[PDB]
Symmetry: C3
Subunit: 333 residues, 3 copies
Amino acid sequence: DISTLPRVKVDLVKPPFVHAHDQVAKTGPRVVEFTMTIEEKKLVIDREGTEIHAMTFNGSVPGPLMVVHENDYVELRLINPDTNTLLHNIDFHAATGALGGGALTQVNPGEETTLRFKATKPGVFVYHCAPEGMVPWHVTSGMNGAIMVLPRDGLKDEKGQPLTYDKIYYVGEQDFYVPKDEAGNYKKYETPGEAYEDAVKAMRTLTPTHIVFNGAVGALTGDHALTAAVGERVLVVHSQANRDTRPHLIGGHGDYVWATGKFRNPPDLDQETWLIPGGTAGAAFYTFRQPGVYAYVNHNLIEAFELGAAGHFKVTGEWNDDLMTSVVKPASM
Amino acid sequence: DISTLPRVKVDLVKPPFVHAHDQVAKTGPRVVEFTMTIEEKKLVIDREGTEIHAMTFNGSVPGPLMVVHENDYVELRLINPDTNTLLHNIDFHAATGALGGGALTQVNPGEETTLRFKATKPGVFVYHCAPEGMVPWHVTSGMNGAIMVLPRDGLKDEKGQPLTYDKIYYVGEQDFYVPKDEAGNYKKYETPGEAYEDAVKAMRTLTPTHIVFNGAVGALTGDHALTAAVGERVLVVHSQANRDTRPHLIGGHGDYVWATGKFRNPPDLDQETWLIPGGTAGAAFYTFRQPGVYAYVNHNLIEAFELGAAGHFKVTGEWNDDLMTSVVKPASM
Amino acid sequence: DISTLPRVKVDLVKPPFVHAHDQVAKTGPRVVEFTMTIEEKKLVIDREGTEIHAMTFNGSVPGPLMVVHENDYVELRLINPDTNTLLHNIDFHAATGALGGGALTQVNPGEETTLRFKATKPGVFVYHCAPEGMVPWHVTSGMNGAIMVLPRDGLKDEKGQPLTYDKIYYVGEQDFYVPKDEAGNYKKYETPGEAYEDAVKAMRTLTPTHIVFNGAVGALTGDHALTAAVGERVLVVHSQANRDTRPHLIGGHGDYVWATGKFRNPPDLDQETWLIPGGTAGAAFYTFRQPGVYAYVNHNLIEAFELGAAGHFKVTGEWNDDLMTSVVKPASM
Ligand SMILES: [Cu+2]
Ligand SMILES: [Cu+2]
Ligand SMILES: [Cu+2]
Ligand SMILES: [Cu+2]
Ligand SMILES: [Cu+2]
Ligand SMILES: [Cu+2]
């Protein structure tokens, strides 16, 4: 009887940050309540000022990361304010039935709905908008995110021993297909509906114009770099709702990787690079051993360094010469 | 001494259906006899009437699914009627030696051949035509299929306990590269040989014009939807002979997945989406828990909803509100 | 104290061959010393005479395969002769810190440097040049290779029993993006710097013009075919530093496969085809059972047979009719 379960309301945080949670469950099963507001808005995605009409959950690309435990109930209030123009919905890959909730959550501007589903399978999962006839347009306009369903006893390594993380970040990777004129300049549109027919033609080429982390080229660089300390255990959740990706930590590894993001499976060890298939979320666990700047990339290096799928970590602490040292610094012969 | 083994002749069925078989082997090793007839034919692949010269095993795209058990012998009579124009052959990824049989099965129109091979490795495997100098043309014209080599004791879960399926379907996914004029309209050709030079140029772009299940856009929709009941255990075999795919059941999961299709390996659990590499067959096991319409897609959603890689399941039974319910149906705020 | 460790200098060999090593370590941990010389040179990559300015480690595409054991130290002397024009460096995916050594190894023409790192994780790993601002250009001009870090007790199968190989080959797969004129003819350039701006535009299409093994179309064919004997155990290391690949042995299998190349993980069994993600090295173990010609391909068959990602094995010994036989050779009906 779900009426007699405790309820906890959770306020979401912008990526790459993640709302507060417990790894190991300190309560019985709960109804966990979330509210998300849909926002259609203009987004500048690159240093040249290219602008798209993004379709967002809660104002961000990606949508925020939701965290619950196995056999919790997720209750989502989805609001579509009347300032928007399009019909939207939400499809949870975590959920069972009705097209992941898509068939139950169709909201025109000025409408809201409340969905509940039971989080029966532990893992990280993609969620995304999927309106009939217009699925790829919404998704590739940024309307996707992820939910993490933790095991009630938290994460385990390949030997069934606890893995505890000190920090968690959510990297959502987004392929954009911005229409071009004959010469290759990006077009501008006053309203999403204006862009529709050009968007369809752009998508059909199967060639993204931009691939970005957290909604823009350079979004996770400089002062917006991810941070950690030597000796800190970091979990990086990575989702791609539409297109394959191959994450790599330049200077590091995936010590324990769930490339396809499902925790009943043992992790892969010592990964240099792993493939997250389009429409999947994955998770990688690393203990930092060296300080300095790391780049986190899609290791199609064209996609990373030309199209935008690259971020930085800034790591503090002591340099360890046992692991790596310059024996003879670069010098003329 | 193979002469003293029992023989069983099997009649193949069109995909997505699969010929009758036993999961757990009720006999000793056998010689299992199959006949396939090659058919070159015109195929309408989309709602606009685009026509290609398809090259088929037994008149279908994909070719039918063959089912045997480990250490059976497969004996294939391959017939190339004189109404065809091209040289064909067959390459079994299940088999060992002579380019999977390709070097032994080259048949001009008006010729036949009988190949035998021992099915030494359990799994689902791609088979395809592969004539020297013209391999990708035949394959991407639809000349490929799969064979399932079951373990003699059937399928097992990750703990070594039996998995029995109630229903099995075969989804063959096909990338087509239909040549275009300057404006982007599809060309027509009277004979396959006419299309050759344009096909090569079209293929080199690496950009399919169509990606379809069971040979046409919408082939697995409406009255041709796959069917199951709540509580039924369904195995979905999925092959892609040339290009990577990432299958997803909208509203469901892969409870147990062999993404690369080889049964001596434990399955992956609780998959939302899995990657089947080009040139591989995979298998996914799901128990339906909710009724209604499900979409089975390639979760590059452009490939699914724009290029054709989407099908439907129609599932009967009772709705379970514990798993999912509309708490507040869409309404004005 | 690394000063008191034994030192062994190793001379590298051209791919597809691999320098002499022990599988099971016969000594304690060592400092293993390697020297590589960077060479910018013109390369003919196809039968039509297309020429690129390749950027190489030790004069080859790919760079040579390095072999050490876990917890050895790798000491690399990297030389950039003054006949070169560009700044180069080296990034080891095997190493921890300083962008895999990239931040420590920036050498202008006329400079050298010596890097040391501890090989803490067993596996096959990509290494590549990665100069800030110009990473994909160097990598896709051929400046990448692999290092194998063997477990001290060698390789093990899924049951923890020894796997010993008789032969080892290194296949490096390279995507090239050669700029084209309007009509589709390849351009020539006198100097790498001349080609830069056209290279960037070519890369952005995400469509390779050539995908080759060992630096050229047909490089591993005919008299340069890989060789083995029936009953021989062969390890094939395969790397792709930038783009996904899906290797397949036509006529064979991967008996034991580390698709993502990391040996603390159990291998996948009985693979027909496996996905190596861009930026990864993998390894496949096969025991040859049948003689004759095998093709080793990327099983995107367009990439293999049109763009160049195909090689041959030539295998000697006795034909086994139990595994495969022609029952009725091709004949008129
Ligand atoms: Cu939407
Ligand atoms: Cu989805
Ligand atoms: Cu054929
Ligand atoms: Cu094949
Ligand atoms: Cu370089
Ligand atoms: Cu790298």
